[PDB]
Design a protein around this ligand. Structure first.
Ligand SMILES: *[C@@H]1O[C@H](CO)[C@@H](O[C@@H]2O[C@H](CO)[C@@H](O)[C@H](O)[C@H]2NC(C)=O)[C@H](O)[C@H]1NC(C)=O
Ligand SMILES: *[C@@H]1O[C@H](CO)[C@@H](O[C@@H]2O[C@H](CO)[C@@H](O)[C@H](O)[C@H]2NC(C)=O)[C@H](O)[C@H]1NC(C)=O
Ligand SMILES: *[C@@H]1O[C@H](CO)[C@@H](O[C@@H]2O[C@H](CO)[C@@H](O)[C@H](O)[C@H]2NC(C)=O)[C@H](O)[C@H]1NC(C)=O
Ligand SMILES: *[C@@H]1O[C@H](CO)[C@@H](O[C@@H]2O[C@H](CO)[C@@H](O)[C@H](O)[C@H]2NC(C)=O)[C@H](O)[C@H]1NC(C)=O
Ligand SMILES: *[C@@H]1O[C@H](CO)[C@@H](O[C@@H]2O[C@H](CO)[C@@H](O)[C@H](O)[C@H]2NC(C)=O)[C@H](O)[C@H]1NC(C)=O
Ligand SMILES: *[C@@H]1O[C@H](CO)[C@@H](O[C@@H]2O[C@H](CO)[C@@H](O)[C@H](O)[C@H]2NC(C)=O)[C@H](O)[C@H]1NC(C)=O
Ligand SMILES: *[C@@H]1O[C@H](CO)[C@@H](O[C@@H]2O[C@H](CO)[C@@H](O)[C@H](O)[C@H]2NC(C)=O)[C@H](O)[C@H]1NC(C)=O
Ligand SMILES: *[C@@H]1O[C@H](CO)[C@@H](O[C@@H]2O[C@H](CO)[C@@H](O)[C@H](O)[C@H]2NC(C)=O)[C@H](O)[C@H]1NC(C)=O
Ligand SMILES: *[C@@H]1O[C@H](CO)[C@@H](O[C@@H]2O[C@H](CO)[C@@H](O)[C@H](O)[C@H]2NC(C)=O)[C@H](O)[C@H]1NC(C)=O
Ligand SMILES: *[C@@H]1O[C@H](CO)[C@@H](O[C@@H]2O[C@H](CO)[C@@H](O)[C@H](O)[C@H]2NC(C)=O)[C@H](O)[C@H]1NC(C)=O
Ligand SMILES: *[C@@H]1O[C@H](CO)[C@@H](O[C@@H]2O[C@H](CO)[C@@H](O)[C@H](O)[C@H]2NC(C)=O)[C@H](O)[C@H]1NC(C)=O
Ligand SMILES: *[C@@H]1O[C@H](CO)[C@@H](O[C@@H]2O[C@H](CO)[C@@H](O)[C@H](O)[C@H]2NC(C)=O)[C@H](O)[C@H]1NC(C)=O
Ligand SMILES: *[C@@H]1O[C@H](CO)[C@@H](O[C@@H]2O[C@H](CO)[C@@H](O)[C@H](O)[C@H]2NC(C)=O)[C@H](O)[C@H]1NC(C)=O
Ligand SMILES: *[C@@H]1O[C@H](CO)[C@@H](O[C@@H]2O[C@H](CO)[C@@H](O)[C@H](O)[C@H]2NC(C)=O)[C@H](O)[C@H]1NC(C)=O
Ligand SMILES: *[C@@H]1O[C@H](CO)[C@@H](O)[C@H](O)[C@H]1NC(C)=O
Ligand SMILES: *[C@@H]1O[C@H](CO)[C@@H](O)[C@H](O)[C@H]1NC(C)=O
Ligand SMILES: *[C@@H]1O[C@H](CO)[C@@H](O)[C@H](O)[C@H]1NC(C)=O
Ligand SMILES: *[C@@H]1O[C@H](CO)[C@@H](O)[C@H](O)[C@H]1NC(C)=O
Lengths: 282, 178, 303, 178, 303, 282
């Protein structure tokens, strides 16, 4: 090859396969010794002037160095990296903001040991989208909407590129199904001095929703003691206040609040936590 | 009663019609054919280009104030009712035709209730005569595939218009009305 | 040898006067001027009411006429001295129809409408009175006439076609006869308030374990209900084989299977279950109760 | 089957029609009026003088041989069926009109059976076209009393013709046929 | 940028060949000559069947065609290389209808007629086949078409109008579709042989005296029977509350009240009575048996 | 009056009435003595020269003779007959022969002691009948028919004339209802040697029926033993023969036969008598 002191070349091999590795264009009847990570290899592995690896595992990757017999004269350096061909990615999108656009990620079910190249392309019937992304974490299109009730099913496809293989996956959806806001923030419950068997729970609206007055949300409340471990479901209308009368005299409760649009989308996750104590005169 | 119970009745009727239309569209897609039964099936719209669409911008949807919205809903519902009544000749099934007639009667009742809501608020426009050209719309000469495409697009547009009318009724009941 | 009676088929009211004449045809009309007599509904009228005008005409004067015996009209026959029938006529008397009242309608599974009204006037039943039912939408619709009459009894009509929901209806009855015409008051009716359903079929009563004073009653909900617009409410009653009194059970709206208590062992009981719809997505008022199901008898295993 | 079962079927049908006509005539006389409900009520016949009578001498009745009798029965039954079908507009009662329609259907079936019996014996006269002037006989302008007299005389003539046809069928089954 | 498929909506038989072409519209029709492919019912056809003719026409050859998956016809869509839908067509294939067989009719109380037939051919079920029922008198009558179809199930019709008695009827079914037309054989039917009536209502079982092994079963004859043309014949059966086997009683044609024997004391029995008409004033053969009445349970007083 | 020895006059009076009967135009201050059937009357009954009878009964009729005082010189003879005014007659007609006419009688429910005069008049719609009668017993029109199925209700009226009063009665009927032939004649039953539990009964046709072949009759048979006294009804078709299998081995039977047209009229009376014995081997 080129000069021995040059930057080594990178070669990729699949898992459990077979591959030979000669150092340069030297003859077959030459004295060749190999070294990995600073230790010598056994002579029972050399096929003349080449090195064959039968059924490579993950613990064979590294720098394959080929030196002269009983010396430190380098001739050819090469880095070996073993990886797995990519599988079909998992794609499922969600609109955190109904008035604005949507966003989604893509990830492989089985992780690989080689960085891949991804592709993004949205159709939306017969059109062209942008998918501009300057986010903190990768794998997020953050597309923006342009119309309302367009009656056109969106179509997005994710592609993966790799030196060992490739795959593709495409899904279809609409703006009415993939709608799920974020759970409410700052869920704090306070007692009431008048009625002992009563609790007051107050929550807020997530700041992600741009128009909380034009597109109202339908809240949900869940209350449960700590020793009873049985949740009772109650549905609420528009409003950030609730008055529960199922509180005990000396027992604690855990409250969880959800969020959902009026008639569009599905339910969201519950709150983080909530703790309160009933009123007691002493 | 005023606008109190009327808007709630219209909302309940729109929800019931939406459920019935979902069921009827599922049945019609199962009966139409294997290609039309596919989950996505997004072809370019070329057969049906005369029925009114339900695509509007956000600012344009917020600009109208209780009159243009109701007029557009009335005219679109009348057009969709005429199209669904004309669609009865295509299907050949006892239970399917019975469900079609039931949905037609329910949509006519919903149109009448919308007209009554418009007339109850005190708007000097009870029924401004629309169209009268597509008042019957007799079935012209067309192929079977084009007819199935027209039926699918009509069902999709009816679903979209039902969703839009439900959203508009909710907005009117929340913001503009107490 | 025939006679002519004038006027032919008149029309009068209850209490008005009547003037009729019977003129016979005879060349020596001497004895015929006094031999003719009047007969009404097979009854010979008194000769004091009839008067003689000349040799070929007889006069009759009647007052305070009453209702007709039959709908076809009273028969006035001018008889001869020997009893021969010379001529005949018919009399139509009655009163104009008034506005009908007490109109009520009910809907069965929101698939048909049956209305029942009452005339309320005693003067219209004498003559043939026409009754027509008109129903239409309040804001957008046209007048529709009901066709299937007498589906349950007198003065009733059946509407087999489906009707629109969540929309009030205007129903009125029109009365028309030979005298005049009248229209009933407009009644605003909602179909969601007159919902009626069928009783729950498949009533099966079985024992549970070895308890002699407890039973189990299970049934199947009626498939006619769509379960989307409203929810039915069941009710159970039972009696003793030798007793006529019935003991009613409280609301069993949700539970399709209910267990009785306090029963006497070694006794046969008859169970009848009925269901009643409630109000969902609208007026929360309940609907009309349904009829009781067929009695299903079961025996309690004595100790 | 020949003339064996056919004559017996015609006899049974004539007996059933006679019973039904007796019942219907009783009902119609009870509904008509008090004078027509009297037991005797024998007035001179002047209103109905166009329908064929059923009065025949003994020697004349014995002279005919299986052809003139059947032809007269067929034409008289057709005329009576037409008259009774036209008589439906006079009565106004649900059950009465239902019984009238049932009797008309039964009389039409009896006429068809008589025609089949005539055609089965091998007579080259299946249906010689009679009348066609009174084929419909629309109700002309007449009084109510004259109409009731016509109805009573029609019922009496129908009863007499039923009796005569039963007697003729019995005679044909006994003497001329084995 | 549309295509045209020829022929449009053809009509072929099961097993015949099919030749269709898809011509795209493009100015440089180089890649479109081989980028197009055929799709039948959402299934991609193998490229070995398709052939290329020139730059703007694609050929397809199919043989031994089978029955249609749906009644509307198979969909043949000409797709582009990117998956766009260019044009579509429908294929109608089937077999001519044969003569229907196994036709049977029954009459209920001589007030209606209900017939049921069977197609009997597997080739007509693919395409839309029209079924019409014609009934008329044998010697004097005209063809009458039945209107109320599907009164009891598939391939059935209901005749609500009254029919003439003591006269045979000619009933036949006609089959018509896009291919051909066929008529069934004429069937001579007598109404007096298919008489069917309702089960006797008002089934009441009561005890007699103090006997523990004997009961009494009484009922009311169905008012629908005129009692003049025929006489019904009753039949009684009973079972044990815990046993599924049924014990039948002999003819109780005349007696409206019958007493059972051999019953075990202190046991609840269910009684079901059905009636069957006989032949009077005609063929003495009995008619079709009716369904069993509602079970009426009674308890035997033990000693 | 006229000369005494002339024929006496006849005078009629009702029952229980009061009448005065003088003999001639004699003065009121004359000596009058009355005699009945040859015996003298008490002077306590004479009202001067006249005789008054208070409430006459049936035992007062006879010859009322008026003689001179203490002599046998006759002056006036009168025959007194007491009677009852006639009531409404009983009229009901019957046609013994269907091809021929009909006949009927008329009689009073309460018999009277004075011969009356009767009238006969038949209308038959608007016509005139004869009612010619030369019979053995009176009260029989014996009218003859003229048409068949005339569809005209016959109307006959019976009138009664008497010196004390009169009455009238009229009825209406048709030729189809009043039809009843005579019972059969010569009903003789003979046994059969083959079957012991069998009897042969033979009857004949009444000679009154003129056309038994054109208008057939439907016979009826009734059989009953002497000790069980229970009749069992059986209907027969056209024929003058019957075969009964309900005969006993050693019991006698009583047979009775009736007569009736096919579908016209009602049933007639039974036969006179019948006796027979079954077969017995010895
Ligand atoms: C060890 O090296 C020798 C020499 O390169 C290999 O022998 C060659 O094998 C290939 C493939 O079987 C043949 O095409 C050549 O012709 C062979 N060359 C000679 C000189 O024999 C041998 O296969 C290697 N052994 C292993 C296990 O890889
Ligand atoms: C040679 O040394 C390199 C450098 O440490 C080894 O590569 C690391 O291997 C471990 C164990 O699998 C991994 O957790 C690290 O992520 C690897 N580092 C990099 C930069 O890849 C290599 O495994 C060694 N090879 C041998 C045969 O000892
Ligand atoms: C794309 O990914 C799919 C999903 O793993 C691959 O399909 C698998 O292929 C392997 C090898 O042919 C089979 O053993 C598996 O059974 C397949 N799984 C499924 C779910 O089909 C596909 O081969 C990949 N495509 C490419 C070009 O690598
Ligand atoms: C993957 O993404 C790359 C980057 O955009 C695509 O490459 C471009 O594709 C467009 C559309 O065909 C061309 O106009 C550009 O000229 C391409 N640029 C380069 C540098 O190649 C590529 O087509 C995408 N692949 C898929 C399968 O979507
Ligand atoms: C007998 O009296 C009657 C009734 O008064 C007369 O009939 C009237 O005649 C005049 C003219 O002739 C008409 O204007 C009336 O309308 C008739 N009335 C009725 C009830 O018929 C009749 O003319 C008189 N006859 C004689 C000979 O004097
Ligand atoms: C109509 O009603 C009137 C009133 O009741 C009847 O007139 C009565 O008739 C009876 C007998 O004829 C008399 O005794 C009364 O004095 C009458 N009363 C009056 C007030 O007139 C009349 O008879 C009825 N007519 C009919 C045909 O029923
Ligand atoms: C129509 O309905 C009204 C209301 O129920 C009836 O009026 C009542 O009728 C009952 C029964 O006769 C009486 O006991 C009440 O005193 C009546 N109340 C009033 C306020 O009048 C009326 O009778 C009904 N009419 C008809 C023809 O059925
Ligand atoms: C490409 O081939 C097609 C099919 O052979 C040609 O279409 C035919 O054209 C002729 C005359 O132009 C017509 O008579 C046929 O009916 C056509 N057949 C079909 C199936 O369309 C077409 O013309 C050819 N085009 C060129 C440019 O050669
Ligand atoms: C119509 O039926 C024929 C006969 O079964 C089918 O032809 C078979 O197709 C399969 C798969 O394509 C082949 O493996 C067989 O060898 C074929 N057999 C014959 C005899 O051709 C044909 O696929 C069917 N077509 C449809 C649309 O269902
Ligand atoms: C029509 O009726 C005939 C007669 O019952 C049927 O023929 C019998 O069908 C049964 C049931 O399959 C078989 O067990 C017999 O062996 C058949 N008998 C004969 C002589 O073929 C026939 O199957 C009926 N057809 C239809 C379509 O119902
Ligand atoms: C007895 O005879 C005398 C005389 O005739 C009757 O007296 C007469 O009675 C009638 C009627 O009472 C009167 O008109 C006469 O004027 C009376 N005449 C005299 C002279 O008084 C007397 O009534 C007879 N007694 C009886 C019982 O008949
Ligand atoms: C007078 O004598 C005559 C003649 O005997 C009686 O008349 C008879 O009376 C009896 C008894 O009532 C009747 O049975 C006879 O029929 C009567 N005969 C005649 C011819 O009428 C008369 O009764 C006697 N009168 C008195 C007063 O003794
Ligand atoms: C004709 O006969 C009838 C029947 O007896 C007579 O009617 C009776 O008359 C008497 C006296 O008037 C009454 O006491 C009876 O009650 C009547 N009976 C009946 C049944 O009406 C009638 O009077 C006789 N006519 C004549 C003129 O004598
Ligand atoms: C009773 O019978 C007598 C005897 O026939 C009737 O007297 C005859 O009646 C006719 C008809 O009116 C007249 O032409 C004769 O001139 C009458 N003759 C005599 C001698 O009077 C009498 O009319 C009958 N009475 C009734 C009431 O019928
Ligand atoms: C009643 O209505 C029927 C049909 O609507 C009509 O034939 C009849 O003449 C009407 N009668 C009256 C008295 O109006
Ligand atoms: C009735 O209530 C029970 C318990 O509250 C519940 O399990 C059941 O689902 C209810 N019925 C319906 C129809 O929802
Ligand atoms: C079947 O009959 C109906 C009505 O009789 C008709 O509308 C339809 O076109 C017919 N179909 C065929 C294929 O003949
Ligand atoms: C049945 O027979 C009994 C006795 O034989 C009899 O009393 C009864 O009338 C008969 N039933 C009818 C309907 O005639």
């Amino acid at each position: 090859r080129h000069s021995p002191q040059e930057a080594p070349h990178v070669q990729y091999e699949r898992l459990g396969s077979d591959v030979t590795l000669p150092c340069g264009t030297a003859n077959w009847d030459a004295a060749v010794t190999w070294r990995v990570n600073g230790t010598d290899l056994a002579p029972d592995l050399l096929n003349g002037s080449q090195l064959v690896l039968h059924g490579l595992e993950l613990g064979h990757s590294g720098l394959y160095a080929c030196f002269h017999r009983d010396s430190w004269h380098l001739r050819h350096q090469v880095l070996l990296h073993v990886g797995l061909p990519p599988r079909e990615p998992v794609l499922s999108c969600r609109s955190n903001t109904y008035p604005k656009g949507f966003y989604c990620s893509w990830h492989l079910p089985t992780p690989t040991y080689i960085p891949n190249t991804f592709n993004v392309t949205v159709l939306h019937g017969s059109k062209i989208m942008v998918c501009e992304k300057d986010p903190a974490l990768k794998n997020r299109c953050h597309i923006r909407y342009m119309h309302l009730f367009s009656t056109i099913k969106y179509k997005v496809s994710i592609s993966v590129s790799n030196a060992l293989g490739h795959n593709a996956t495409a899904i279809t959806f609409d703006e009415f199904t993939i709608v799920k806001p974020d759970p409410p923030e700052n869920v704090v419950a306070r007692p009431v001095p008048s009625n002992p068997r009563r609790l007051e729970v107050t929550w807020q609206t997530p700041s992600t929703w741009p128009d909380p007055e034009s597109f109202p949300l339908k809240f949900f409340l869940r209350y449960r003691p700590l020793i009873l471990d049985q949740w009772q479901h109650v549905e609420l209308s528009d409003g950030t206040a609730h008055t529960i009368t199922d509180a005990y005299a000396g027992k604690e409760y855990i409250i969880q609040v959800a969020a959902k649009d009026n008639e569009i989308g599905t339910w969201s996750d519950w709150s983080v936590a909530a703790h309160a104590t009933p009123w007691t005169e002493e | 009663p005023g606008p109190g119970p009327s808007i709630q009745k219209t909302y309940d009727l729109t929800r019931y019609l939406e459920h019935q239309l979902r069921s009827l569209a599922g049945t019609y897609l199962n009966y139409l054919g294997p290609p039309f039964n596919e989950p996505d099936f997004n072809p370019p719209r070329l057969g049906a280009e005369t029925l009114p669409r339900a695509t509007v911008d956000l600012e344009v949807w917020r600009s109208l104030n209780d009159k243009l919205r109701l007029t557009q809903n009335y005219e679109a519902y009348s057009h969709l009712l005429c199209y669904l009544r004309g669609l009865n000749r295509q299907a050949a099934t006892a239970e399917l035709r019975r469900s079609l007639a039931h949905f037609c009667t329910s949509l006519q009742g919903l149109l009448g209730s919308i007209a009554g809501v418009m007339a109850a608020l005190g708007y000097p426009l009870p029924q401004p005569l629309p169209g009268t050209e597509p008042t019957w719309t007799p079935g012209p000469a067309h192929s079977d595939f084009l007819q199935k495409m027209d039926d699918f697009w009509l069902l999709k547009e009816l679903q979209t218009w039902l969703w839009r009318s439900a959203k508009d009724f909710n907005r009117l009941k929340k913001k503009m009305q107490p | 040898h025939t006679a002519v009676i004038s006027p032919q088929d008149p029309t009068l009211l209850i209490g008005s006067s009547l003037l009729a004449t019977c003129s016979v045809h005879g060349d020596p009309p001497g004895a015929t001027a006094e031999g003719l007599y009047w007969t009404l509904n097979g009854r010979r009228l008194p000769p004091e009411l009839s008067r003689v005008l000349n040799a070929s005409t007889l006069a009759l004067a009647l007052a305070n006429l009453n209702g007709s015996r039959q709908r076809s009209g009273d028969n006035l026959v001018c008889h001869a001295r020997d009893g021969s029938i010379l001529a005949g006529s018919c009399l139509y008397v009655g009163l104009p129809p008034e506005k009908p009242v007490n109109i009520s309608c009910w809907s069965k599974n929101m698939k048909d409408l049956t209305c029942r009204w009452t005339p309320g006037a005693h003067g219209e039943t004498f003559l043939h009175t026409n009754y027509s039912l008109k129903y239409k939408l309040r804001w957008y619709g046209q007048d529709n006439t009901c066709e299937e009459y007498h589906t349950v009894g007198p003065h009733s009509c059946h509407i087999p076609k489906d009707l629109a929901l969540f929309t009030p209806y205007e129903i009125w009855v029109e009365a028309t006869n030979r005298l005049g015409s009248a229209r009933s008051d407009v009644l605003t009716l909602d179909i969601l308030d007159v919902v009626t359903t069928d009783p729950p079929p498949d009533v099966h009563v079985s024992r549970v374990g070895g308890l002699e004073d407890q039973l189990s009653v299970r049934w199947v909900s009626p498939p006619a209900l769509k379960d989307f617009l409203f929810q039915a409410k069941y009710q159970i009653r039972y009696r003793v084989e030798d007793s006529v009194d019935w003991k009613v059970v409280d609301d069993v709206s949700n539970q399709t299977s209910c267990r009785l208590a306090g029963l006497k062992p070694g006794t046969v009981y008859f169970v009848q279950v009925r269901c009643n719809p409630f109000g969902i997505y609208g007026s929360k008022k309940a609907g009309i109760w349904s009829e009781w199901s067929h009695p299903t008898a079961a025996s309690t295993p004595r100790s």
